[PDB]
Design a protein around this ligand. Structure first.
Ligand SMILES: OC[C@H]1O[C@@H](O[C@H]2[C@H](O)[C@@H](O)[C@H](O[C@H]3[C@H](O)[C@@H](O)[C@H](O[C@H]4[C@H](O)[C@@H](O)[C@H](O[C@H]5[C@H](O)[C@@H](O)[C@H](O)O[C@@H]5CO)O[C@@H]4CO)O[C@@H]3CO)O[C@@H]2CO)[C@H](O)[C@@H](O)[C@@H]1O
Ligand SMILES: [Zn+2]
Length: 472
């Protein structure tokens, strides 16, 4: 059977299923309704930055259509919806004056969700730093971001927190650090060679440190001011792809473990244990900022749950560790990526070149966190795959590969949960085809097809798969 034995009965009582979007990727009205620009508006409006010179000005127009989209998610039997608030739609300059029209939108969206029995899971930040803060403060390079972010979070808690009980601060700070400040391919386009300036060896570490301090400060504000009355939770969303040793050699096993530590441990060791991974301290040395005892104690235990975005897996090959002139965060790991073993690829690729379909990576990641970090409450906050550009509507709708993807990945998630992993929920990326950052509209991740000419929504086979799997 096409469900392959999956249903709500196959998961724990009260396990949460949802779909996910992010503000810039779906809302549209990017320069309307009082919204100020983000670093993504500026970046996407520069010729050559995004596929087809596309941008999120209109995107899926969820701003106008949100009731349609909520009706659709309810009809597909989801329990929850993860979306983000655009900082610059609330505070067009990132601080100071509140855009009341922006506030009204999120009130309307949250209220409709609740009216329809869909639980809002709300991200405060999803790459979309207000342009004004980038220009005035230097963005995430500036330790002052902790104060600026805390003040924004405080406003959101006060304004929405009587209704919203599930918050996330950040989405994938690793990718902000990597793409914004190591490779310089996402805004602010910083790197050692980059026109904007930068230093691929130092800035990714400064940026990560500031995300951690900002998360901790926002959570401290929630707990001391709002939580007694509101009784909600705040976590963080971190990407984690699985790393498997290419062989059972000491060097390959060490390499895979180094990759895990530089990828997820970078954030989870501070959040769970109050320090960076030992290997990162050993290899990165004075380029890795030091938490004071007070900061470390603020960061430790500051996530009520850990969101994990899980997509893919790689093999890892290792080498003797060597003294080397620092060049970048990526090069600091001293590992070699490998995508085949015994002459067989680890899995076929989706439309995105980085996205290898490897369902057992889901089990890898979930098991690893359970065993290493004392089984923290985890929520799978994104999982999904993409179709390419230029298909016909019907080809988009017959998304047989995506159906297989969800059945296989969720089977592997079920295996990990059945072995005792503390996973509380699962969210599909994405509800809708949307603006996929550098890929623009050339990458289709949705379980619902969006015709980008007419803006019409049409559920794909994977949407109906979820509907069948999730019927109550
Ligand atoms: O995209 C859907 C949805 O997901 C969330 O964010 C995504 C994000 O959009 C993607 O950009 C990001 O992609 C990263 C991959 O997950 C990650 O595996 C990949 O790793 C690179 C690595 O950075 C790179 O150094 C490495 O290069 C090696 C070469 O492969 C070798 O041949 C060469 O010899 O050596 C170099 C380095 O030693 O390769 C791998 C790629 O295979 O990096 C990607 C970024 O480039 O994934 C995110 C999720 O993990 C987001 O929430 C949503 O908004 C978004 O729409
Ligand atoms: Zn519209």
């Amino acid at each position: 059977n096409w469900l392959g034995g999956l249903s709500r009965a196959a998961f724990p009582k009260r396990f949460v299923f949802g779909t996910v979007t992010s503000a810039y990727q779906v809302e549209g009205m990017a320069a309307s309704g009082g919204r100020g620009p983000s670093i993504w508006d500026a970046f996407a409006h520069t010729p050559g930055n995004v596929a087809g010179n596309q941008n999120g000005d209109v995107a899926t127009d969820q701003y106008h259509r949100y009731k349609e989209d909520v009706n659709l998610m309810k009809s597909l039997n989801f329990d929850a919806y993860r979306f983000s608030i655009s900082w610059s739609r609330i505070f067009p300059d990132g601080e100071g004056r509140v855009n009341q029209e922006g506030v009204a939108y999120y009130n309307n969206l949250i209220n409709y969700l609740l009216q329809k029995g869909i639980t809002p899971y709300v991200n405060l930040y999803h790459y979309d730093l207000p342009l004004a803060l980038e220009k005035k403060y230097g963005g995430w390079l500036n330790a002052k971001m902790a104060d600026l972010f805390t003040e924004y979070a405080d406003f959101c808690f006060k304004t929405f927190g009587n209704r919203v009980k599930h918050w996330f601060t950040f989405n994938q700070p690793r990718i902000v650090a990597l793409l914004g400040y190591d490779q310089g391919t996402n805004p602010p386009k910083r790197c050692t060679k980059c026109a904007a300036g930068g230093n691929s060896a130092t800035e990714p570490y400064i940026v990560a440190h500031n995300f951690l301090l900002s998360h901790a400060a926002a959570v401290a504000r929630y707990r001391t001011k709002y939580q007694a009355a509101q009784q909600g939770k705040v976590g963080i969303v971190l990407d984690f792809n699985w790393y498997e040793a290419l062989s059972n050699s000491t060097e390959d096993q060490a390499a895979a473990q180094r990759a895990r530590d530089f990828h997820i441990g970078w954030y989870l060791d501070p959040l769970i244990n109050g320090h960076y991974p030992q290997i990162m301290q050993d290899l990165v040395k004075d380029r890795l900022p030091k938490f004071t005892p007070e900061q470390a104690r603020l960061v430790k235990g500051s996530a009520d749950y850990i969101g994990i975005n899980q997509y893919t897996a790689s093999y890892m090959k290792g080498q003797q560790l060597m003294q080397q002139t620092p060049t970048s965060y990526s090069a600091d790991w001293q590992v070699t990526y490998v995508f085949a073993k015994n002459g067989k690829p680890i899995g076929p690729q989706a439309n995105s070149n980085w996205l290898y379909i490897v369902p057992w990576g889901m089990y890898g990641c979930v098991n690893y966190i359970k065993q290493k970090y004392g089984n923290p409450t985890v929520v799978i906050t994104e999982n999904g795959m993409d179709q390419p550009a230029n298909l016909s509507r019907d080809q988009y709708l017959r998304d047989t590969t995506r159906v297989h993807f969800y059945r296989s990945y969720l089977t592997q998630l079920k295996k990990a949960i059945d072995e005792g992993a503390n996973v509380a929920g699962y969210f599909a990326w994405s509800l809708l085809d949307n603006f996929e950052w550098l890929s623009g509209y050339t990458s289709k991740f949705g379980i619902v097809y969006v015709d980008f000419n007419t803006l019409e929504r049409h559920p794909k086979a994977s949407a109906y798969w979820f509907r069948d799997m999730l019927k109550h």
